[PDB]
Design a protein around this ligand. Structure first.
Ligand SMILES: [Zn+2]
Ligand SMILES: [Zn+2]
Length: 53
């Protein structure tokens, strides 16, 4: 039950980032600014970035 915040589909899961703060995701091809690959190390969605201080 993992979907992309931008386009609201959950296909091409090999291109699908997973937030390490929660259970949301993003296709790398939907992300702006540009993202050429899935990174090693942690990625945080914009909802989790709002919780930062
Ligand atoms: Zn997408
Ligand atoms: Zn998150």
């Amino acid at each position: 039950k993992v979907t992309c915040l931008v386009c609201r589909k959950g296909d091409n899961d090999e291109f699908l980032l997973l937030c390490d703060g929660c259970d949301r995701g993003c296709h790398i091809y939907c992300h702006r600014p540009k993202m050429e690959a899935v990174p090693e190390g942690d990625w945080f969605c914009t909802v989790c970035l709002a919780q930062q201080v």
